[PDB]
Amino acid sequence: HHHHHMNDLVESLIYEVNNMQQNFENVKSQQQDHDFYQTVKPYTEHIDSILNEIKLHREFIIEVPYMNSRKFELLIANIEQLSVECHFKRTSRKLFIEKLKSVQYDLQNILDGVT
Ligand SMILES: [Cl-]
Ligand SMILES: [Cl-]
Ligand SMILES: [Cl-]
Numbered sequence: 001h002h003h004h005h006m007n008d009l010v011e012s013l014i015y016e017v018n019n020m021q022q023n024f025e026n027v028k029s030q031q032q033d034h035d036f037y038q039t040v041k042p043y044t045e046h047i048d049s050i051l052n053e054i055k056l057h058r059e060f061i062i063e064v065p066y067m068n069s070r071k072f073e074l075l076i077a078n079i080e081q082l083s084v085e086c087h088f089k090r091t092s093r094k095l096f097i098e099k100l101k102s103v104q105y106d107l108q109n110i111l112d113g114v115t
Helices: 005-030 036-056 069-085 093-113
Strands: none
Touching (some): 005 036, 005 069, 005 093, 036 069, 069 093
16 A cells, blocks of 8 residues: 555566576576575575565555456465576476566556556
């Protein structure tokens, strides 16, 4: 409900989802998984912190155009999943990039809505 904070939260996830794309590109070129405890755990926990905040604004966000309760829950899960998958060389490019595009698509609609 407080939307310059929501703005920054959403812009924060946008930045982070872009970062996830670069991480995926790095594990793929390098053909090496990132270290679970030194890289993956801390990263996914930092993503969880942002998501925990954005969940506090659930009631507002679900009411913006293009959003609803179900779509909000899938968006969160999709972002969590990407935050992990981007660290694995075996992650499918086809499925990862499709899910990333879908997440950036939702995030933009939210950004428009909270603005
Ligand atoms: Cl629904
Ligand atoms: Cl739906
Ligand atoms: Cl985006």
